[PDB]
């Protein structure tokens, strides 16, 4: 015993029906400035505070517009016991 299998009900329509709600990009603003929920997977409140604090001001933008493996003993003298290290 097996099911009947019908062909799909083809549904004709005009192309314009799918072009509805499509607005030209010269009338769409960057509404993402009001997007709130999208920030939950991106940033954090402390990270937001850091970003606000460390944003580059305009003046810095305008201004914008040897390794070797040494040893501590090689550079700095050891310190006698009971003495404050000074460098």
């Amino acid at each position: 015993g097996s099911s009947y299998v019908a062909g799909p009900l083809e549904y004709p329509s005009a192309s314009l029906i799918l072009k509805a709600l499509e607005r030209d990009f010269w009338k769409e603003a960057d509404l993402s400035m009001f997007d709130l929920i999208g920030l939950e997977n991106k940033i954090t409140r402390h990270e937001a505070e850091l970003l606000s604090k460390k944003k580059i001001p305009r003046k810095l933008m305008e201004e914008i517009s040897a390794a070797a493996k040494l040893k501590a003993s090689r550079l700095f003298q050891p310190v006698q016991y009971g003495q404050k290290p000074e460098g």
């Binding site: 769409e28 603003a29 400035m33 009001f34 997007d35 709130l36 929920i37």
Partner: protein, 130 residues
């Protein structure tokens, strides 16, 4: 935003093949760099429903969210408060302008006592329209 849209093939190549399933669009007429000051009008409800549910996400749960049955939901007072704050910030910056309008409720006799009793608080709010 860095968004890239490929709006077809140049019509100068319409004869590169005799039969291709492609969309030919003419070469742009103006300069390569285009500047336009524009305006768009939105309602606060549009921002509310935009932030009601994530959209445009490439993650599988967002793709299923695109697939699922669209339902109205009881948007929270907290989301509305946050949207009010953001709109206020951008009004201060100067890139948005509030345009308060009118809500017309014809045949208002059809509201029940509960709707009227809520409309007391709704009208007494400082964000309500006329």
């Amino acid at each position: 935003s860095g968004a890239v849209k490929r709006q077809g093939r140049c019509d100068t190549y319409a004869t590169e093949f005799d039969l291709e399933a492609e969309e030919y669009v003419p070469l742009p007429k103006g300069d390569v760099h285009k500047k336009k000051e524009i305006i768009q009008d939105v309602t606060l409800h549009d921002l509310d429903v935009a932030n009601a549910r994530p959209q445009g996400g490439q993650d599988i749960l967002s793709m299923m969210g695109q697939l699922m049955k669209p339902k109205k939901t009881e948007i929270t007072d907290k989301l509305r408060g946050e949207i009010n704050k953001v709109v206020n910030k951008y009004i201060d910056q100067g890139i948005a302008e509030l345009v308060p309008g009118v809500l017309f409720v014809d045949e208002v006799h059809m509201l029940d006592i509960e709707c009227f009793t809520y409309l007391h608080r709704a009208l007494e709010s400082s964000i309500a329209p006329i």
